[PDB]
């Protein structure tokens, strides 16, 4: 139905700039006020600013901390919302959201989020490693396997098992940030009679570095 599709997020150097887009569809765009909100990793939601309707002269309003640096922008005929952020800062690191101003200045529909990282660290592809149980381990009706995604920057990555076919006993753990490098892990648990017997592969993707690795999980041998 009503949709907001966000794009534009990525690594930027401090003092740099970036434009985020928010593609709208499913409603009469030119009637509604639009909003941006941010949320730093592991923190609360903060308001960025609003752009109003054609009938209100595209009026714009911002939270003070971004008053002179950010510009909210609007393409009615194409249903696009923009947030260009100038002179970026370490603190500007966050998940960014567009939303539609529904009923009473409330936010009825939200875009899915786009991550913006501000740092001087360099964009680095991950090394995908398999996690196979040790050779001399006793059985227990089910086996757990995994993947280790180590030494990468910035977030995000996506992990799936068998292209999406295993979505069940999956645990993809949040990345942790060591020395300007993220390390992630993912576990998959299957009936012990569908492995090694059958194929189990993890699909890692790191769009920033255009990485597309797959890793079959192999038994272990000498």
């Amino acid at each position: 139905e009503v949709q907001l599709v966000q794009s534009g997020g990525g690594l930027v150097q401090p003092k740099g700039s970036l434009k985020l887009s928010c593609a709208a569809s499913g409603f009469n765009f030119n009637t509604y006020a639009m909003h941006w909100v941010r949320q730093a990793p592991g923190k609360g939601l903060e308001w960025i600013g609003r752009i109003r309707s054609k009938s209100h002269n595209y009026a714009t309003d911002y939270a003070d901390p971004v008053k002179d640096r950010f510009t909210i922008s609007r393409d009615d005929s194409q249903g696009l919302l923009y947030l260009l952020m100038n002179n970026l800062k370490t603190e500007d690191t966050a998940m960014y959201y567009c939303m539609r101003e529904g009923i009473y200045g409330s936010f009825a529909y939200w875009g899915q989020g786009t991550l913006v990282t501000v740092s001087a660290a360099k964009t680095t592809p991950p090394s995908v490693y398999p996690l196979a149980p040790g050779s001399a381990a006793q059985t227990n009706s089910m086996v757990t396997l995994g993947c280790l995604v180590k030494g990468y920057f910035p977030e995000p990555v996506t992990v799936t098992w068998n292209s999406g076919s295993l979505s069940s006993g999956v645990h993809t753990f949040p990345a942790v940030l060591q020395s300007d490098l993220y390390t992630l892990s993912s576990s998959v648990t299957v009936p012990s009679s569908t492995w090694p017997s059958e194929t189990v592969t993890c699909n890692v993707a790191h769009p920033a570095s255009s990485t597309k690795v797959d890793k079959k999980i192999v038994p272990r041998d000498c």
């Binding site: 309003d61 398999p130 001399a136 995994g146 645990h171």
Partner: protein, 218 residues
Amino acid sequence: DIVLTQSPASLAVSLGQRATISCRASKSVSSSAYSFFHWYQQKPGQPPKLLIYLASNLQSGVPARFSGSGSGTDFTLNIHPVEAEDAATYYCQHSGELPFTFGSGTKLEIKRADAAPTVSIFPPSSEQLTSGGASVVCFLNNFYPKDINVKWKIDGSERQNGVLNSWTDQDSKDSTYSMSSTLTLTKDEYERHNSYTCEATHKTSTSPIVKSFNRNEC
């Protein structure tokens, strides 16, 4: 600014029980005002979802078990009966006079029966070894409550140096947590030691749950 003070920061409730989340506002100035309240639910890797509009009106699609109320500065969100999918963080919001402001956030732990972690250790990959480094990973999956501790043992010795831990958000279907611990040594000292223990202490057990591997089984 209308500055919203949320409380509590977190609470834990049983399936079917009542949950109550409070939000306070400072009062502002001009008679030309008209300011409103709204509540939001945010689940793990998701945008917040609008629950209740103007303090007490219910949103299209959200179940009969969410209700809001309040007068002037004090606002309340009620969840009854509480269901497993309610494990989320909740935010109040203000909408009238600029700026629009959000509350601090309130996390709902779903309280659920005690449950043991399924733990599994994994030796380093032959591939990582090729590039001078060695990671030994331990999975402590599907436990409750959140509180857990992992001790790494290299031979007969405790090892605190390159240990990296990670926790999942409370699970939405069952109500469990899962953890992941990664000990990262250099290849050299991975090779000059042999026995590798992952030791998990938890509420459900008096003795530590132990998984181990000897380096001599490729």
